[PDB]
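Lab notebook, page 48
Experiment: co-folding of the full assembly
Goal: obtain a model of how the components sit together before planning crosslinking
Operator: M.T.
Materials (sequences as entered):
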Amino acid sequence: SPGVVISDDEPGYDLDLFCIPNHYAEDLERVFIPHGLIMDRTERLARDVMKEMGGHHIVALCVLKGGYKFFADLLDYIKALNRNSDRSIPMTVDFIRLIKVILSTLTGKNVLIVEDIIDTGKTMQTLLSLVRQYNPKMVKVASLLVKRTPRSVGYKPDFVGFEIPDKFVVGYALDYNEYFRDLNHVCVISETGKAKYKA
Amino acid sequence: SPGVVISDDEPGYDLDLFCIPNHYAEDLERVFIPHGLIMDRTERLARDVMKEMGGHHIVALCVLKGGYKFFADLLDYIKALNRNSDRSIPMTVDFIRLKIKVIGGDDLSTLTGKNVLIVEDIIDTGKTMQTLLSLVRQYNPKMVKVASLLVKRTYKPDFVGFEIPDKFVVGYALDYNEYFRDLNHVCVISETGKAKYKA
Amino acid sequence: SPGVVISDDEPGYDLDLFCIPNHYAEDLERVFIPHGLIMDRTERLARDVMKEMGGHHIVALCVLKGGYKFFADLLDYIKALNRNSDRSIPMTVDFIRLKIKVIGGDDLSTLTGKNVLIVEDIIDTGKTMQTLLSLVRQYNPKMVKVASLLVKRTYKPDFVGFEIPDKFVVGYALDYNEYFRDLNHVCVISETGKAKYKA
Amino acid sequence: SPGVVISDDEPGYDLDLFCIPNHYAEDLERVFIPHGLIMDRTERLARDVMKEMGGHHIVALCVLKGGYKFFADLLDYIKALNRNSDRSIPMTVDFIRLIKVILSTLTGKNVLIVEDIIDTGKTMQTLLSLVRQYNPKMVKVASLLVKRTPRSVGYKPDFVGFEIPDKFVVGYALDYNEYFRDLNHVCVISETGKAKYKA
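Observation: model returned without errors.
Model output:
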């Protein structure tokens, strides 16, 4: 499944239909993905991940790109799930940066690469090649968002939260020059916000 | 401020009074700090941090030691407060590793003129903290403060969640050989637990 | 304000995209309003209510029809806003039943001079609402407003969560013969579901 | 089990250790039961209830005394639990007022009476007598709080959240003249608050 698909013909929810920090009132266009919807989808991703990767010890390799919300939410749901397991399930949580990756002894384990927004295919291919050099049991990729960029064909993640158009989105785990971290929803930024918070 | 102090005489809560994953029933002695209490205390820490460091650009330096929970919850509460601000205030989140040798998403040069908050789950060695602070201060931060969820008696952080006795606790953000990640409460491990999950 | 409008053409979300209790897998067609979206919308309703009725004593008259969820969530968000108020503002919560004939914790005389908010999960008959409002207004309330989570097309509430087509939905606060209470999302029941849980 | 016992020698947490609405700063003495702790305990009560009453269809008879939080939280945890059941579990939620009770066909079902704070024994005995006239499969009582009043020996609930001293507590589900509903913790009121919010 390509996840929740949001077509190019979808502008997003009018801002007055949701609760948005007052200080961002003119800095956004529409709410594209309400926070609660992100949670609901992520809860399902957690289930899909455990079903396909519960076979061996899982190592969650979270690619740090500025945010932490998606990693925390996905992992929180995963843990809540393993909480009901009849047997104690060990799990490893690592955070890396990207290219060059920053003692990876993930040998004989199921590696789950986690990203907020999937990057180019060449970057993803390179990361997959690097990880496979450690002889993991398996390697899967989960991304909250996948953008349909007009450029080359992007990577196809194993677990996808939402497939969205090529829009400049902020919020949840997508800051803009360190602004919008307090915005819980994924929203489209306005020209006003773009200028106001430009580096 | 020592934070919530838990005396050495404090036995803790009996396991039967709380919801604990069945697969850990024999691996724990009792509940020391219920998840809910951790959350409530962390929400106050958020307010204290914002009271002293709010209104300006805060850079949260989270020292990775295997857990993410405390960082996530503290940051979530901080962001919830930042939302009601009349003016949009930027905030930087950076998960770094120690050994001097800091692995961050950007040079420490960006710390100049900012309010730096170092966050940790627990501070074992005080010397390592004294060193990190010295390094940070070399870049002329506006201010530098330290927040720690726990402090084991026998460095004094600016913001402390709980001060507990020197006991072997696990849960919330203190995994044991990658076990207990699914345990939301901070509890004292049992002899059975230590041996069972020993590396 | 019609609130979030869901067109008659809107098919809804496929069941495989969300977390649904396994015992309901064959009892539903699809997810119409994800729990998270309901929460986000309700949080905005809270703000709208406080914007127009805040600052004064609000009496929330919740019309019991079998569910409590919507009342609880709306009230929780309202209370969360009331907390930041510089002055303490009292608020009364009263769960009443209709048939005229109102069963409340206190006489309607206490409604005099107060801001009355009637809350419902869904308004089936508009006449019953017109009658209730007439009764309430007889006690000279400062104002009287109505909030409803859902409005089925073919009375216009002051605060509406979602406007959906005339379909048989269950979940969140719409049980079916005491079934679906554990279903957090609002979904369309299936033919299998209707027969299986029929009274 | 008598639940979480809080002795008469316990004054409660200093207010500056937790997050309290600013407008109640001088209106309270101490935080007696942090909100998060109430949740954790209630989660366990939900488990205890299902284990002993999961045998037959359960009817939750919530005694309205002004609040709704405990009913909502207990029922939310119960539902989250029945969510993982291999078979669909039907459940009925009713709200009554008290004495005289306000079509009780709870025949052949397990009745769970729910209260925030257990009332006198004669009142509880009377309610139990009234309910048993409908020939229910069983009748159990759950109360968030039980106060050790100096008067006659109170009733002994089947499920008890916390057993507390005879202190004037407010918050969570215990309003005082409609104030403190926005206070999430159970706290001891001050003489200042008592006078300020007196009817």
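Interpretation: The helical segments of chain C are 35-53, 69-82, 126-137, 191-197.
Next step: discuss with group before ordering constructs.
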